[PDB]
Amino acid sequence: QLTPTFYDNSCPNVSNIVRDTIVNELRSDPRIAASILRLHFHDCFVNGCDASILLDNTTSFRTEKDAFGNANSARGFPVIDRMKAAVESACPRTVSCADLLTIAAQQSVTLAGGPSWRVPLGRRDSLQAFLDLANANLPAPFFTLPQLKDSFRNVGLNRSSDLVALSGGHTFGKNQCRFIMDRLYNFSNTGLPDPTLNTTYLQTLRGLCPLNGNLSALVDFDLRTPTIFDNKYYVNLEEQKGLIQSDQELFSSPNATDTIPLVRSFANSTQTFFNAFVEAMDRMGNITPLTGTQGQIRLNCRVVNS
Numbered sequence: 326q327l328t329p330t331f332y333d334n335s336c337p338n339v340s341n342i343v344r345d346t347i348v349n350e351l352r353s354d355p356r357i358a359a360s361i362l363r364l365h366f367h368d369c370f371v372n373g374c375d376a377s378i379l380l381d382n383t384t385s386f387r388t389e390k391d392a393f394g395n396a397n398s399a400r401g402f403p404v405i406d407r408m409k410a411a412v413e414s415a416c417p418r419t420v421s422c423a424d425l426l427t428i429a430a431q432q433s434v435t436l437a438g439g440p441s442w443r444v445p446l447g448r449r450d451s452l453q454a455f456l457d458l459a460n461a462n463l464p465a466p467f468f469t470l471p472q473l474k475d476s477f478r479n480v481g482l483n484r485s486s487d488l489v490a491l492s493g494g495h496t497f498g499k500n501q502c503r504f505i506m507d508r509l510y511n512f513s514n515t516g517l518p519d520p521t522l523n524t525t526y527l528q529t530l531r532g533l534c535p536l537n538g539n540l541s542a543l544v545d546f547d548l549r550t551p552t553i554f555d556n557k558y559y560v561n562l563e564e565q566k567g568l569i570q571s572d573q574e575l576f577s578s579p580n581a582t583d584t585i586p587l588v589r590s591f592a593n594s595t596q597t598f599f600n601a602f603v604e605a606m607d608r609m610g611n612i613t614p615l616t617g618t619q620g621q622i623r624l625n626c627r628v629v630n631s
């Protein structure tokens with residue numbers, strides 16, 4: 326059983342060390358908080374939160390960093406290396422990379438203005454990486470609501486609240502033009518833009534992502550508060566201003582009878598959203614963890630101990 330007090334005796338200053346690292350990095354990279362939260366998400370959706378995503382290539386297994394959902398997208402790995410080294414200095418061979426990344430995600434959310442809470446701890450590090458599993462398990466922006474639900478259920482998150490609350494992670498961070506080109510110019514081979522995208526916002530997005538333009542150009546997930554962790558993400562959905570297909574479907578999908586009330590509830594109250602987000606985050610952080618003597622306490626998050 327994971328517990329928030331896991332390192333209260335062995336490394337009481339772990340959370341503080343993680344926080345300081347992120348505070349320092351935010352000065353040169355204001356996007357790092359969002360990037361770190363996403364790393365935790367992609368870690369947990371593949372064999373659980375076991376730091377498998379942090380592993381680099383080996384001749385026996387491929388890195389998850391080359392998965393369609395991570396390649397030329399996932400970032401912040403050097404920052405994780407930095408806090409790991411700092412934590413190793415303060416508490417040698419004590420904090421797992423899996424736990425470190427979980428704390429980093431929570432601290433990132435709080436630093437961005439989100440809720441503050443103590444995450445359950447006690448996770449251990451994987452002995453291998455899972456590229457095929459990452460390609461199969463990570464959801465894509467073009468997923469329909471049924472597919473999004475399937476993706477979450479596949480890893481153990483059955484609740485629509487899990488999906489709606491965790492999608493709130495898009496209240497900050499960036500998204501490449503490549504992922505919305507269809508919504509802007511030819512959605513579902515209709516030759517027309519996605520009808521669920523607000524027409525005024527459509528114009529703005531087309532200006533940022535012209536046809537045949539730079540597909541790697543970055544756009545803000547939340548047009549209201551691009552870098553602040555708040556409930557504005559849901560207010561956007563209510564106005565048909567969700568950026569990617571998977572965002573807007575939470576409010577507009579024919580299958581959204583169960584998610585619409587959640588979107589509204591989170592848009593109506595910051596407290597309701599924050600509570601639901603913490604609840605969902607801890608549930609996601611509880612996905613098939615290695616505990617006790619299973620796995621290791623990786624010293625270098627990029628490689629298995631030898």
Ligand code: HEM
Pocket residue numbers: 356358359360361362363366397398399400464465466467468473491492493494495497498499500501504569571
């Ligand atoms: C529900 C399905 C989801 C899909 C299909 C999805 C898809 C995406 C895509 C397409 C990007 C843009 C990547 C890029 O352009 O490089 C992204 C970024 C991001 N996602 Fe999601 N996401 C989902 C759920 C989540 C969840 C559950 C969280 C965390 C609680 C999360 C947090 C983020 C953050 C913070 C970013 C910004 C990262 C950065 O700017 O570096 N996402 N997501």
Ligand SMILES: [Ca+2]
Pocket residue numbers: 367368369370371372373374375376377378
């Ligand atoms: Ca993992």
Ligand SMILES: [Ca+2]
Pocket residue numbers: 496497547549550551552553554555556557558
């Ligand atoms: Ca925001």
